[PDB]
Amino acid sequence: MNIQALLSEKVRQAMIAAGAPADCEPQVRQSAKVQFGDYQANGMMAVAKKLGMAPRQLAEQVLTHLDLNGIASKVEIAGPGFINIFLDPAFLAEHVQQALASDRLGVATPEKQTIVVDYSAPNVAKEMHVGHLRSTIIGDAAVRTLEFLGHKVIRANHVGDWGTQFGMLIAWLEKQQQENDLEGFYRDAKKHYDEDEEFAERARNYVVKLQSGDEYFREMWRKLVDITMTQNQITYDRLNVTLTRDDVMGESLYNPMLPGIVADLKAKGLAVESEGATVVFLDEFKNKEGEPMGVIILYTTTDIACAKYRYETLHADRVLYYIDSRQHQHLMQAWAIVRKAGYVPESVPLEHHMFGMMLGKDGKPFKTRAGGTVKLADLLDEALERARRLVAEKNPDMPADELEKLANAVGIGAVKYADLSKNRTTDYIFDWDNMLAFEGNTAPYMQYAYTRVLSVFRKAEIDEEQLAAAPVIIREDREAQLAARLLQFEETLTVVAREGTPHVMCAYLYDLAGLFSGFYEHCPILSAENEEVRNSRLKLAQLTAKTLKLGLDTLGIETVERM
RNA sequence: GCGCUCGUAGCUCAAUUGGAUAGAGCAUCAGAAGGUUAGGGGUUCGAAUCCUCUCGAGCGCGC
């Protein structure tokens, strides 16, 4: 149920009937304060200028043809001409009911698109670092959200499985095999190819045979790759990320394309051998002219083939990119090249969602106390430990068999539900005291809140198959608030899918919880004057439980049934 | 030197993308307090949001 889009039309299909142009835009948002009802129409003022009249007069000129009967119970004008809509109880207590009768809670299925999500993107022959945790989590949240809506999501893991370093890598592997897993690999082999070593010409030659390709050096490649991706699939499985091995499309598939991509870029008149390198000129920035590359004898030419392959072979209607902030240039530049070359059209967006670096409670890069890179596994280990200590001092002397299970949900959930709360792209603070707490917008609070709600719909007799025969009658203004927000689940979902931002979902869920936690300490679902309301508020509570569950599911957050 | 992303309560984060009196959680003496949205100017009915400067933070291409 997308009430916004509903009122969006009935106001648009109005307005016109009060003198308005075709390209018309009502601005139907959710009211800030509760003074302004459940929804606002802001589109007046802006329109009330292109015709040069008066906003507070164009206002009720629309209400004359605006018939929100059976929908709203109170429509009034306020301020410089806002149209405030106070939803009618009987309208809410009809879609609150419709959501219950559906396994998708009334959420409608959009036009079945085909989207490609680019997330995680770890490196080869290196233990996965914590600087990739953000990309992996948010990307998976996007995928889950899109998948629930019904689209066809192609998970894309752009693994750095190619580069110069493989000469330094494979040679070490070839040598490290003469003694007998990856922990001091990339680190030790680096100590050779600089100071000090003699047969690095062995390594610098070992790479030039990989581009040519013969199974021997091809095995030493895949062998080195498959081990890294096996270590990482473990990390994913621990992290509850939906990624898989057959979701890997790294810097290998987008490599034999490099010739006939700049050649075709030259065979279309767009490249000049400036400075000594193939370059392609664009025009939308500074006081002279900037310039990307392609060759010289790069991290911009690969993405072009990438963004092309998504469209031409994978039939991507849309393609999301969850990548570090320090890559916005290299993408936008290399994407503007695809916009003025016609590889991928216009109906196919190339979205880029960004984020900064991991920092601690001190503005410095997130590192260990030794002063170095933090392994993601080592982070998850402490997450589970700190969670155990958390659950212990509140629920001690309890079956260990169901503590690790609960500590898993709390700890691993907190690690995820911490990027799913921030939307910035200018670095971020990692603080255990913020994420692992029963207070605030934290996963444990949501997880506890969900158990709380669920308990109410448990201690009562009223079985499952006759409860939904007694209807919902909303008579009080806290039930109306709750029921409204409950129905705004589709809106939030559509915003997440559109903007690629899961923080909205979490903000909603946090906001959704607070309503219940206020609807509870005032409106006794427990026991009231009659059965008519007892069952009604149960269903009203029953919905949020299903809603909180489904919401947390789209984020990839475990939900324990009991705390 | 050019260029990217930014600057919001003491801290960690919001603000439905230009809407009404900028909101939550810790912290500080259930409600309370906490703000010239780094700062000036400008654009219009209306700005944390957009345009131009200054300062400042982080990172990419530069000789």
UniProtKB/Swiss-Prot annotation:
The keyword ATP-binding applies. It catalyses: tRNA(Arg) + L-arginine + ATP = L-arginyl-tRNA(Arg) + AMP + diphosphate. Coiled coil: none annotated. Keywords: Aminoacyl-tRNA synthetase, ATP-binding, Cytoplasm, Ligase, Nucleotide-binding, Protein biosynthesis. GO terms for cellular component: cytosol. GO terms for molecular function: arginine-tRNA ligase activity; ATP binding. Its EC number is 6.1.1.19. It comes from the Bacteria. PROSITE patterns: AA_TRNA_LIGASE_I (PS00178). It is found in: Cytoplasm. Gene3D superfamilies: Arginyl tRNA synthetase N-terminal domain, HUPs, Isoleucyl-tRNA Synthetase, Domain 1. A motif ('HIGH' region) lies at residues 122-132. Belongs to the class-I aminoacyl-tRNA synthetase family. This is Arginine--tRNA ligase.
